[PDB]
């Protein structure tokens, strides 16, 4: 609220900045004959860490100021869900 | 289309593989993801497995993964086949009057011969050596 | 074996500043250098595909990247060079 | 060929392989169907395959005119070829 | 089993001749057949003949000039004259 | 010279020795303008770096996008290659076509001792890239608090 | 047809002039892809590489393929011909 | 469409006194005088 | 809904038909596309074929062509059914 | 719509010269018209049956009959490239400049399908080369949008 943002803006930024883009090739088929270079173009790849998610850029304020994901949210690894918790003889466990 | 190998692997292969479970008689699974944009995942079964059921079991798992795949991968069509890995035969096509080019011949083959050969019983897979025609819009960034 | 690949970084801040959308950037990059299956058409009674892609001569050289332009929200044409940077790196063309 | 190799160079190499069967195995080789861009491991600018059909067994008397000596002779010739992996091989009795 | 009387013949477009050309051949064959009452009887199409249809052309330029989207045009026409399945509601506990 | 490029990449220490003994070009380049020195810095071949330099390789060779072997070393955290390159006169403040310096790259990937070394060799902390960012801007954005104060 | 794609209307200018697709692109029939190019004895060719379905009889499927091919041949454009560059199947029949 | 190609199905029968076998042969004979690119095939009961 | 015979054929029937590959024991395939907005494609298998296996093989090939069908057809759904069965009885329900 | 009229509409469409001949002798309505207002002459013009066009005209067919959207047999013949039929119609008085409900003329239609000889014949018989459809387009406009350079020069 302090930054006039919603979850919609968060979701949009994540989809835009945690992306894996097919970007094509330099010198791909059909080429101009005589082409010596053939190379993949690599653009955005998926983020791999909480630090990267934290620096996702939600918006830049009119005064040049930056609003990042970590300024409106906590970022951490955690379960897809938290409904299932197991113990083995009283001690924290997991299982199959 | 246009995907590099890591994009293919992390956006397509890993997703299908993670969905490959509860498949009877599976000995092992292997896959390649390449900078052509292409994936192949091979599931090898115990001898005497019914290949109809194997194909059925594999595709039932794949269908769970499909909505999770990129829209462009879905629209290229993904396929599930039960065949030998070597070629049974190669049917060649030429033009003895040289009145059709490599591209012409390939399109004639794709558009007139391939589907019926693909629907023929015992034919597990068909590779076109060439390509069907498509409407090609070749863009110019200057004029754009 | 690994081979040279062209790593291009989209600068998110500059894109937002200039008003160019990430979807326009990625569709322009990918449609041009990678090609895009748009929809189907009918050729001599048979349904076939329609593809959009750069003409070969505009996707062979790294400098060509900046010849492509995206339209900002305010109607301006912005060259790829304005919101991106690039470098050579090594990557795999076949991951097993 | 190495990844990074152009379609043109793969055609240069396929030309040499075709040439060899057409000129140095006249007595034995009936036809050559060479494919640029397709290989055992799958598509690519740097891969290719030649399907060789031989004349009938009755016209190829002696061990020297059989697939083993032919493919050995051919692999030895092709080992001169620069920056490519080229070899002829008999498919095993059963394969797998 | 469904009618095991007479024959059941399929006339096939093997090139890209198209519907009109296939009708003409059908008619040609049907003419010849009817000239052998001695051998062939009641030889007829199983399908339907062409009928008048109302062809409407949208003028792209005039639509663009008035600022009318093609999607609005085509949705308006199709939904109105064709009907459109929008979504589902629930009527006395059954989805419809 | 193509053989020297490949050998340098592979780490083959004595193949690099033989090939230069036999007169190959120390500054041979491949399609993207990388020298054997570029390749050795990228994959982390300290010995080959040192041999190539002792045989008069341009320590400031740049690729087709303006990046130097120091850029690669500092980007990929090869400390023992970074000092060496620097001791042979590497442009500590070299910019590629993006305006990006080795300090930028070290700062971005959080290579603290590398940044310290680059700094002692006189790196411009005020150096901006085409987007007007310094290494400090990076440290702040990346939330690397350690690195941020080392740049003060 | 290409003509029809060429006249797709991208936009209408200020002075009312027309920007057509053929004004920003070359428009042709061409492959979905340009990676695979095949020769038969050095001559331009296409082909079908056929793989046998799991557990199917090779000799029977070869027959079925031949029979299907024969149905196509009369409707070939002039000069078009089937060749047989690689068949593992005659070895089975003949050796037996 | 029949087997993936545009098609038009035609029904008919042998005249009184004639075998359907005979009537099929005449159809094949007539079918063989048709314009370039038109083919044919037997389906259903005829196929059987 | 609302589609003419040709619209059905060229956006639905042809696409499905082009995907009916790799199915066992098929004798032939037929279809009609009509201006009620309907397609029926009927695949007939060798006598002795397991009808369940034939149906699932057909359904699975279809399922994988679904993303190539019009949105509104995917919405209506595409039904695969054993066709060669007949009625035990018809129960009419009238209001008087 | 009369019985023999219906039979005439079908015979003309189906190009059955002999049946048409007999029907003419029996007085089948040459001015019969289906639901969309096509006369046997519309049908023959559409499907290209030259002789039947000639026979219908011998027997009083309205050369300038129009359907419910204002289209004439000349419209149909010109659109679908039936050259000899276009000439017969024009000789028998067909309005060379007839506009349908959309303000489209035989010339627009011929030009649109790239029928060069037909365009020339229509110009010969006095087609108005400056005639505009409901969108203010001429046959020349149609030529150049289509990228037809031959036709474009004909219309200068
Ligand atoms: C009676 C038993 C059937 C024997 O059928 C046998 O078949 C082979 C293969 O088709 C025939 O003919 C074979 O001759 C030569 C001999 O090398 C083969 O290379 C050739 O491919 C084949 O045509 C033999 O002449 C015939 O004797």
DSSP codes of every residue in D2-15: -TT--HHHHHHHHH
Report yes or no: J15 and J9 within 8 Å, Cβ to Cβ. no
Q: CA–CA separation, G59 vs J129, rounded Å?
A: 68
Angle, helices A7-17 vs C22-33, to 10°: value is 20
Resolution (A): 2.2
CA gyration radius for chain F? Answer: 16
The closest-lying atom of ligand 1 relative to the alpha carbon of residue D56 is 19
Using the Cβ of B6 and the Cβ atoms of chain A, whether some distance falls under 8 Å is answered with: yes
Cβ of D58 closer than 6 Å to ligand 1, yes or no, is yes
Q: Which of E3, B15, E59, C2 shows the shortest CA–CA distance to J133?
A: E59
Task: Retrieve residue D23's tokens.
Answer: 């000129």
Specify the residue with its C-alpha closest to ligand 1, atom 5: G94
Residue with token string 């200057």: B142
- Interface with chain A: mutation pick from C56, C64, C80, C93, highest number of A CBs within 10 Å: C56
Using the Cβ of E81 and the Cβ atoms of chain I, whether some distance falls under 8 Å is answered with: yes
Give E34-41's long-range contacts (Cβ < 8 A, gap of 24+): E36/H15, E36/H26, E37/H15, E38/H15, E38/H18, E39/H14, E39/H15, E39/H18, E39/H22, E39/H23, E39/H26, E40/H12, E40/H13, E40/H14, E40/H15, E40/H23, E40/H26, E40/H27, E41/H12, E41/H13, E41/H14, E41/H15, E41/H16
Q: CA–CA separation, A12 vs E59, rounded Å?
A: 37
CA of G94 to the centre of ligand 1 (A): 7
C91 vs A40: CB contact, 8 Å cut-off? yes
Omega of the bond prior to A30 within 30 degrees of 0, cis?
yes
Give A44-47's long-range contacts (Cβ < 8 A, gap of 24+): A44/A17, A44/A19, A44/A20, A44/C10, A44/C26, A45/A20, A45/B6, A45/B7, A45/B10, A46/A18, A46/A19, A46/A20, A46/B10, A47/A17, A47/A18
Task: Retrieve residue J134's tokens.
Answer: 């409901």
Q: Say how many CB pairs under 8 Å bridge G and H.
A: 4
Using the Cβ of A24 and the Cβ atoms of chain G, whether some distance falls under 8 Å is answered with: no
Question: Which residues, 6 or more positions from E79, have their beta carbon under 8 angstroms from its beta carbon?
Answer: none
- Interface with chain B: mutation pick from H4, H7, H41, highest number of B CBs within 10 Å: H4
- Burial category of I47 from C-beta neighbours within 10 Å (exposed 0-12, middle 13-18, buried 19 and up): exposed
CA of G88 to the centre of ligand 1 (A): 17
Neighbours of H28 (CB within 10 A): 11
Question: Which residues, 6 or more positions from C91, have their beta carbon under 8 angstroms from its beta carbon?
Answer: A40, A42, B4, B5, B6, C2, C3, C5
- Interface with chain B: mutation pick from A15, A20, A29, highest number of B CBs within 10 Å: A20
Chain I environment of B71 (Cβ under 8 Å): 67
DSSP state of I67: G
Using the Cβ of B32 and the Cβ atoms of chain D, whether some distance falls under 8 Å is answered with: yes
B115 vs I57: CB contact, 8 Å cut-off? no
SS3 at position C54 = strand
Q: Which of F59, F55, F56, F51 shows the shortest CA–CA distance to F13?
A: F51
Q: CA–CA separation, J128 vs J105, rounded Å?
A: 9
**Do the bridges between strand C84-91 and strand G43-52 make them parallel or antiparallel, or are there none, so unpaired?**
unpaired
Specify the residue with its C-alpha closest to ligand 1, atom 15: D58
B34 vs D44: CB contact, 8 Å cut-off? yes
Residue with token string 């380049």: F29
Alpha helices in A49-92 (DSSP H): 50-54
Question: Which residues, 6 or more positions from F39, have their beta carbon under 8 angstroms from its beta carbon?
Answer: F5, F8, F9, F45
Report yes or no: B2 and A23 within 8 Å, Cβ to Cβ. yes
Report yes or no: G79 and B97 within 8 Å, Cβ to Cβ. yes
Q: State phi, psi for B55 to the nearest 5 degrees.
A: -60, -45
CA count, 13 A, side-chain hemisphere, F6: 6
Using the Cβ of D4 and the Cβ atoms of chain B, whether some distance falls under 8 Å is answered with: no
Task: Output the furthest CA–CA distance in chain E (Å, rounded).
Answer: 67
Count Cβ neighbours within 10 Å for each residue of A55-66 and write b for 16 or more, e otherwise. Answer: bbbbbeeeeeee
Report yes or no: J30 and J41 within 8 Å, Cβ to Cβ. yes
Q: CA–CA separation, J54 vs J47, rounded Å?
A: 14
Q: Which of I68, G27, G10 shows the shortest CA–CA distance to C51?
A: G27
Q: CA–CA separation, F51 vs F45, rounded Å?
A: 10
Residue with token string 């790849």: A45
SS3 at position D65 = helix
Q: CA–CA separation, F29 vs F47, rounded Å?
A: 20
Angle, helices F79-87 vs F46-54, to 10°: value is 10
Q: CA–CA separation, A26 vs D4, rounded Å?
A: 11
CATH superfamily of I1-83: Multidrug efflux transporter AcrB pore domain (3.30.70.1430)
The tally of domains found in chain J comes to 1
Q: CA–CA separation, C65 vs C79, rounded Å?
A: 9
Dihedral sign, Cα of residue G3, residue G6, residue G11, residue G13: negative
Task: Retrieve residue F71's tokens.
Answer: 């850029």
Using the Cβ of E56 and the Cβ atoms of chain H, whether some distance falls under 8 Å is answered with: no
Specify the residue with its C-alpha closest to ligand 1, atom 10: G94
Count Cβ neighbours within 10 Å for each residue of E61-79 and write b for 16 or more, e otherwise. Answer: eeebeeeeeeeeeeeeeee
Asked if residue C45 is part of any domain, the answer here is: yes
Report yes or no: H39 and H2 within 8 Å, Cβ to Cβ. no
Domain that holds residue C57: 3-91
- Burial category of G70 from C-beta neighbours within 10 Å (exposed 0-12, middle 13-18, buried 19 and up): exposed
Q: Which of D30, D54, D55, D58 to mutate to test the pocket of ligand 1 (most atoms within 8 A of CB)?
A: D58
Alpha helices in chain B (DSSP H): 5-8, 14-18, 51-65, 71-75, 102-112, 114-118
Task: Retrieve residue D39's tokens.
Answer: 């290989």
Specify the residue with its C-alpha closest to ligand 1, atom 11: G94
The closest-lying atom of ligand 1 relative to the alpha carbon of residue G94 is 9
Using the Cβ of B119 and the Cβ atoms of chain H, whether some distance falls under 8 Å is answered with: yes
Specify the residue with its C-alpha closest to ligand 1, atom 24: G94
Q: Which residues pair with H12 in a beta bridge?
A: E7
- SS3 assignment for chain E: CCCCCCEEEEEEECCCCCHHHHHHHHHHHHHHHHCCCCCEEEEEECCCCCCCCCCCCCCHHHHHHHCCCHHHHHHHHHHHHHCCCCCCCEECCEEC
Q: CA–CA separation, H30 vs A28, rounded Å?
A: 52
Chain centroid to Cα C51, Å, comes to 14
**Element spanning A90, H or E:** none
Task: Retrieve residue C18's tokens.
Answer: 């200039």
**Element spanning F62, H or E:** none
Chain centroid to Cα J25, Å, comes to 25
**Do the bridges between strand B133-139 and strand C46-54 make them parallel or antiparallel, or are there none, so unpaired?**
parallel
Q: Which of J88, J75, J70, J65 shows the shortest CA–CA distance to J115?
A: J75
Cα angle for residues A49, A54, A58 (degrees, 5° grid): 135
Q: Which of I49, I53, I36 shows the shortest CA–CA distance to I1?
A: I36
Question: Which residues, 6 or more positions from F122, have their beta carbon under 8 angstroms from its beta carbon?
Answer: F92, F93
**Do the bridges between strand G37-40 and strand D29-36 make them parallel or antiparallel, or are there none, so unpaired?**
antiparallel
Q: What CA dihedral angle connects C24, C25, C30 and C31, to 10 degrees?
A: 40
Report yes or no: F100 and C11 within 8 Å, Cβ to Cβ. no
CB-nearest partner of B34 from D38, D42, D51: D42
Q: Which of E9, E62, I1, F89 shows the shortest CA–CA distance to H38?
A: E9
SS3 at position H13 = strand
Q: State phi, psi for E28 to the nearest 5 degrees.
A: -60, -50
B6 vs A45: CB contact, 8 Å cut-off? yes
User: Would you state the CATH architecture of domain A1-82?
Assistant: 2-Layer Sandwich (3.30)
Specify the residue with its C-alpha closest to ligand 1, atom 27: G94
User: Which residue segments constitute the domains of chain D, with CATH numbers given?
Assistant: 1-96 (3.30.70.1430)
Residue with token string 């003060």: F152
Q: Which residues pair with C4 in a beta bridge?
A: C90
Give C26-31's long-range contacts (Cβ < 8 A, gap of 24+): C26/A19, C26/A21, C26/A23, C26/A43, C26/A44, C28/C68, C28/C70, C28/C80, C29/A21, C29/A23, C29/A24, C29/A41, C29/A43, C29/C68, C29/C80, C30/A21, C30/A22, C30/A23, C30/A24, C30/B2, C31/B139
Q: CA–CA separation, H19 vs B63, rounded Å?
A: 52
Residue with token string 């008085």: J93
Q: Which of G73, G52, G49, G70 shows the shortest CA–CA distance to G61?
A: G52
Chain A environment of F141 (Cβ under 8 Å): 55, 66, 68
Alpha-carbon separation of residue F152 from A27, E90, F136 (angstroms): 45, 66, 9
The closest-lying atom of ligand 1 relative to the alpha carbon of residue D57 is 19
Using the Cβ of G51 and the Cβ atoms of chain D, whether some distance falls under 8 Å is answered with: no
Q: How far is B88 from chain I (nearest CA, A)?
A: 15
Report yes or no: B39 and B3 within 8 Å, Cβ to Cβ. no
Q: CA–CA separation, D11 vs D15, rounded Å?
A: 6
Report yes or no: H45 and E1 within 8 Å, Cβ to Cβ. no
Q: CA–CA separation, J57 vs J38, rounded Å?
A: 15
Angle, helices E19-34 vs H20-31, to 10°: value is 130
Cβ of G67 closer than 6 Å to ligand 1, yes or no, is no
CA of B131 to the centre of ligand 1 (A): 39
Alpha helices in chain C (DSSP H): 12-18, 22-33
Chain J environment of G3 (Cβ under 8 Å): 146-147
Alpha-carbon separation of residue H23 from E1, E25, H17, J32 (angstroms): 22, 19, 11, 39
Report yes or no: I35 and I5 within 8 Å, Cβ to Cβ. yes
CB-nearest partner of C1 from D3, D41, D44: D3
Task: Retrieve residue H25's tokens.
Answer: 């042969």
Report yes or no: B139 and C54 within 8 Å, Cβ to Cβ. yes
G12 vs E61: CB contact, 8 Å cut-off? yes
Q: CA–CA separation, H32 vs D50, rounded Å?
A: 40
Q: Which of D28, D30, D57 to mutate to test the pocket of ligand 1 (most atoms within 8 A of CB)?
A: D57
Q: How far is B108 from chain H (nearest CA, A)?
A: 14
Q: CA–CA separation, H42 vs H2, rounded Å?
A: 10
- Burial category of J25 from C-beta neighbours within 10 Å (exposed 0-12, middle 13-18, buried 19 and up): exposed
Question: Which residues, 6 or more positions from E53, have their beta carbon under 8 angstroms from its beta carbon?
Answer: I4
Q: Which of G52, G39, G53, G34 shows the shortest CA–CA distance to G85?
A: G39
E52 vs J34: CB contact, 8 Å cut-off? yes
Q: Which of J101, J139, J144 shows the shortest CA–CA distance to J122?
A: J139
């Amino acid at each position: 609220n302090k930054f006039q943002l919603t979850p919609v803006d968060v979701i949009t930024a994540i989809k835009a900045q945690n992306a894996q883009v097919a970007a094509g090739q330099l010198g791909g088929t059909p080429p101009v004959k005589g082409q010596q270079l053939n190379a993949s173009i690599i653009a955005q790849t998926r983020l791999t860490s909480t630090e990267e998610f934290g620096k996702i850029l939600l918006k830049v304020n009119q005064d040049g100021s930056r609003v990042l994901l970590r300024d409106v949210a906590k970022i951490e690894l955690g379960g897809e869900n938290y409904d299932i918790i197991a113990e083995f003889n009283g001690q924290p466990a997991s299982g199959l | 289309p246009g995907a590099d190998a890591k994009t293919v692997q992390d956006t397509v292969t890993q997703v299908i593989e993670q969905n490959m479970n509860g498949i009877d008689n599976l000995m092992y699974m292997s896959s390649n993801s390449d900078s052509t944009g292409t994936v192949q995942i091979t599931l090898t079964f115990e001898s005497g497995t019914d290949a109809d059921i194997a194909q059925v079991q594999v595709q039932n798992k794949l269908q769970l993964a499909m909505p999770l795949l990129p829209q462009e991968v879905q629209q290229q069509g993904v396929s599930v086949e039960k065949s030998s890995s070597s070629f049974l035969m190669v049917v060649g096509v030429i033009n003895t009057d040289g009145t059709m080019t490599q591209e012409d011949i390939s399109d004639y083959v794709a558009a007139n011969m391939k589907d019926a050969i693909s629907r023929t019983s015992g034919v597990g897979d068909v590779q076109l050596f060439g390509s069907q025609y498509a409407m090609r819009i070749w863009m110019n960034p200057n004029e754009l | 074996e690994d081979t040279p690949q062209f790593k291009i970084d989209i600068d998110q801040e500059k894109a937002q500043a200039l008003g160019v959308s990430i979807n326009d950037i990625n569709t322009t990059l990918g449609a041009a250098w990678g090609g895009s299956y748009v929809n189907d058409f009918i050729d001599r009674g048979r349904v076939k595909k329609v593809y959009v892609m750069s003409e070969a001569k505009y996707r062979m050289l790294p400098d060509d990247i900046g010849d492509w332009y995206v339209r900002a929200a305010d109607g301006q044409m912005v060259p790829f060079s304005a919101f991106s940077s690039s470098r050579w790196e090594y990557g795999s063309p076949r991951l097993e | 060929l190495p990844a990074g190799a152009t379609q043109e160079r793969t055609q240069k190499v396929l030309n040499e392989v075709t040439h060899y069967y057409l000129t140095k195995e006249k007595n034995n080789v009936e036809s050559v169907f060479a494919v640029n861009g397709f290989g055992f491991a799958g598509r690519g600018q740097n891969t290719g395959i030649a399907f060789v059909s031989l004349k009938d067994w009755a016209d190829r008397p002696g061990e020297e005119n059989k697939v083993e000596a032919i493919t050995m002779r051919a692999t030895r010739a092709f080992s001169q070829i620069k920056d490519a992996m080229v070899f002829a091989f008999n498919l095993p009795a059963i394969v797998e | 089993l469904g009618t095991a009387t007479g024959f059941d013949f399929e006339l096939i477009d093997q090139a890209g001749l198209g519907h009109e050309k296939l009708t003409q051949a059908r008619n040609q064959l049907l003419a010849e057949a009817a000239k052998h009452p001695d051998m062939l009887t009641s030889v007829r199409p199983n399908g339907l003949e062409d009928t008048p249809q109302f062809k409407i052309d949208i003028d792209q330029e005039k639509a663009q000039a008035l600022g009318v989207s093609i999607n609005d045009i085509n949705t308006t026409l199709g939904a109105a004259w064709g009907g459109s399945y929008v979504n589902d509601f629930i009527d006395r506990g059954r989805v419809k | 010279g193509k053989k020297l490029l490949e050998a340098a990449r592979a780490g083959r220490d004595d193949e690099v020795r033989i090939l230069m003994a036999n007169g190959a070009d120390v500054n041979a380049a491949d399609v993207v303008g990388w020298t054997p020195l570029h390749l050795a810095a990228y994959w982390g071949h300290l010995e080959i770096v040192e041999v190539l330099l002792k045989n008069g390789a341009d320590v400031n060779a740049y690729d087709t996008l303006g990046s130097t072997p120091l850029h690669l070393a500092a980007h990929f955290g090869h400390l023992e290659i970074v000092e060496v390159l620097l001791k042979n006169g590497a442009d500590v403040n070299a910019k590629d076509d993006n305006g990006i310096t080795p300090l930028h790259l070290a700062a971005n990937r959080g290579h603290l001792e590398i940044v310290e070394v680059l700094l002692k060799y006189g790196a411009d902390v005020n150096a901006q890239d085409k987007f007007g960012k310094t290494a400090f801007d990076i440290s702040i954005n990346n939330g690397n608090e350690d690195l941020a104060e080392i740049l003060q | 047809s290409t003509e029809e794609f060429g006249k797709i209307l991208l936009k209408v200018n200020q002075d009312g002039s027309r920007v057509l697709l053929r004004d920003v692109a070359k428009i042709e029939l061409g492959g979905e892809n340009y990676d695979i190019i095949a020769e038969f004895n050095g001559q331009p060719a296409s082909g079908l590489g056929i793989k046998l379905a799991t557990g199917a009889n090779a000799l029977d499927t070869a027959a079925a393929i031949r029979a299907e091919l024969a149905k196509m041949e009369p409707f070939f454009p002039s000069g078009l011909k089937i060749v047989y560059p690689y068949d593992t199947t005659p070895f089975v029949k003949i050796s037996i | 469409r029949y087997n993936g190609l545009p098609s038009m199905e035609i029904l008919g029968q042998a005249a009184p006194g004639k075998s359907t076998g005979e009537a099929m042969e005449l159809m094949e004979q007539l079918a063989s005088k048709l314009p370039t690119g038109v083919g044919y095939d037997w389906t259903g009961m005829s196929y059987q």
